[PDB]
């Protein structure tokens, strides 16, 4: 007999106490190493409900990662409106690591091990679990890099389908490689390729798997205009900030070709941590490079008295929890009296 | 320059024992992965064992796994390749080769063979 | 494991015309993810080590002529020498690494004069 809880979960990772990387330095003196044996208690004939979208799991993920670019990736200025802190700027060795997650004492984990569980309702498959899987903490908007994999088909996430301007979060079951490079002109320019072959199955499979849902016709469309961190594809490569133009991936007229899109590193962005701005130094010497898996695609649907056949979906992120719930959505925590 | 020099090689009796040496100069060899590839005479390629920078992880072709051992010494810049129980199908040219890592599954995975030694020959022989 | 099988098995080709080499695998060394064929074409001289010809099934290794040119995708694969030079006759193998590694049996290019 166990019902729900809440508890202040603790960490692991296989961090490096070496390092000069950051994350392996926040997991040094945040986190301890991870299980060897992680037991896991496949216990049948049951049927508990989870939800990623009321998971607190999402909200200690959230405090963890801000606190973790805080002593990390210290911009130089910081703007509130209001609280205008000016810092020291120096560069950062950048590179995510996986980060599980786990129970204190009498808390325990349930993980859904069914393989289409749709983010919320009952399972039958579900397990006793000790640690999550290693999640890498990657920040990014429109495009889910480096995560982990729907097994079977695409899994359409959401929390209010048929209700308009609710986040979407499609759940790939195939990866789509994004290679993203600054050369050795300008500094800030900078580009990826992406397979356009590849891309133009997964957003046709992905296009198969909306109507499943709605009996209409889906199409794809670049954002209209919001802030530069929703409108183009924005992630954080080794320290820099990319901004990198995905019209060419959502215009519906995806071609044979090996996609360039153009991107730009910024250094005045907006914060996803929270409210504001921030400013950080001018990008390093070198090559700047980034080969990413794309797990999934943060979606907004387009509203209105659709009467209209088609039904346009738009690329766009914004709330960073929703990257830790297309990983933590598997995980409900339980309390044992 | 890039030079891989074999080593060891001659007459082994029938089920005999050999140890093969790899002497490599001019490029990080703590750093990439090695190989040994034989070629039967007149016959073709046949890939035998490699091994990464750490010797923490080898693999060999199946005709070979038992009784071959590939190994490395990094403060040497050597590699090994111990063969037991030796048979007329082992009568070949062994060549040590540099191995280029290459992008698979997003990690870094032993690629091609980007350069190769002159090769030692081992005659299993009554 | 996969298995490569070049055809033919060996060819005689005059100077200047075209040599074509294939190469199949038994299962596809195609990654989709990256749309990258894990094929490589190496050429081994009279009396020499084998040589990288060509990476990724297309890419030319440095050094290497523009008459080599490799193709194909999947578990198709070809090796085609534009205009044959003296200097390439040599029995040619064709090698993946998607799983391990296996070369094909190897084809010999003989030149008629």
């Known amino acids: 007999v166990w019902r729900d809880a809440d508890t202040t979960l603790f960490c692991a990772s296989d961090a490096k106490a070496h390092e000069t990387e950051v994350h392996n330095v926040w997991a040094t003196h945040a986190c301890v190493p991870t299980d060897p044996n992680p037991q896991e208690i496949h216990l049948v004939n049951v049927t508990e409900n989870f939800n990623m979208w009321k998971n607190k799991m999402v909200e200690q993920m959230q405090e963890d990662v801000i606190s973790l670019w805080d002593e990390s990736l210290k911009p130089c200025v910081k703007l509130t409106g209001g609280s205008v802190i000016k810092q020291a700027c120096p560069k950062v060795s950048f590179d995510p690591i996986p980060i599980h997650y786990c129970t204190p004492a009498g808390y325990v984990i349930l993980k859904c091990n069914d393989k289409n569980f749709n983010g919320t309702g009952p399972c039958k498959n579900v397990s006793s679990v000790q640690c999550t899987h290693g999640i890498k903490p990657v920040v990014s908007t429109q495009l889910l890099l480096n995560g982990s994999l729907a097994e079977e088909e695409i899994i359409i996430r959401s929390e209010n389908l048929t209700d308009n301007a609710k986040n979407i979060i499609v759940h790939l079951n195939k990866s789509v490689e994004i290679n993203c490079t600054r050369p050795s002109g300008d500094i800030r320019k900078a580009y990826c390729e992406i397979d356009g072959t590849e891309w133009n199955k997964t957003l046709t499979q992905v296009a198969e798997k909306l109507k499943e849902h709605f009996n209409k016709t889906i199409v794809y469309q670049p954002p209209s205009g919001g802030d530069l961190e929703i409108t183009m594809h924005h992630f954080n490569c080794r320290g820099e900030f990319f901004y990198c133009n995905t019209t060419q991936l959502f215009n519906n007229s995806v071609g044979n070709s090996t996609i360039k899109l153009p991107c730009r590193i910024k250094q005045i962005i907006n914060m996803w941590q929270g409210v504001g701005q921030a400013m950080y130094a001018p990008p390093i010497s070198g090559a700047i490079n980034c080969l990413s898996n794309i797990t999934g695609i943060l979606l907004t649907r387009d509203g209105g008295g659709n009467n209209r056949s088609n039904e346009t979906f738009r690329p766009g992120g914004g709330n960073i929890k929703d990257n830790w719930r297309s990983e933590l959505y598997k995980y409900k925590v339980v309390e044992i009296e | 320059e890039v030079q891989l020099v074999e080593s060891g090689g001659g007459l082994v009796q029938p089920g005999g024992s050999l140890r093969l040496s790899c002497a490599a100069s001019?490029?990080?060899?703590?750093?990439?992965?090695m190989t040994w590839v034989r070629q039967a005479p007149g016959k073709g390629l046949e890939w035998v064992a490699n091994?990464?920078?750490?010797?923490?992880?080898?693999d060999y072709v199946d005709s070979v796994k038992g009784r071959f051992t590939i190994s490395r010494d990094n403060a040497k810049t050597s590699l090994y390749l111990q063969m037991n129980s030796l048979r007329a199908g082992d009568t070949a040219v062994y060549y040590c080769?540099?191995?280029?890592?290459?992008?698979?599954?997003?990690?870094?995975?032993?690629?091609?063979?980007?350069?190769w030694g002159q090769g030692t020959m081992v005659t299993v022989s009554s | 494991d996969i298995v490569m099988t070049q055809s033919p098995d060996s060819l005689a080709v005059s100077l200047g015309e075209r040599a074509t080499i294939h190469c199949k695998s038994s299962?596809?060394?195609?990654?989709?993810?990256?749309?990258?064929?894990?094929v490589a074409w190496y050429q081994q001289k009279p009396g020499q080590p084998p040589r990288l010809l060509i990476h990724?099934?297309?890419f030319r290794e440095s050094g290497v002529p523009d008459r080599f040119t490799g193709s194909g995708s999947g578990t198709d694969f070809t090796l085609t020498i534009s205009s044959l030079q003296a200097e390439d006759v040599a029995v040619y193998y064709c090698?993946?690494?998607?799983?391990?590694?296996?070369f094909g049996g190897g084809t010999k290019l003989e030149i008629n004069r």
């Open positions: 080769a540099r191995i280029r890592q290459v992008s698979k599954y997003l990690q870094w995975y032993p690629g091609v063979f980007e350069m």
């Open positions: 001019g490029f990080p060899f703590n750093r990439d992965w």
């Open positions: 091994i990464n920078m750490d010797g923490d992880k080898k």
């Open positions: 299962q596809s060394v195609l990654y989709r993810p990256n749309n990258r064929n894990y």
């Open positions: 990724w099934a297309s």
């Open positions: 090698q993946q690494y998607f799983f391990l590694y296996s």
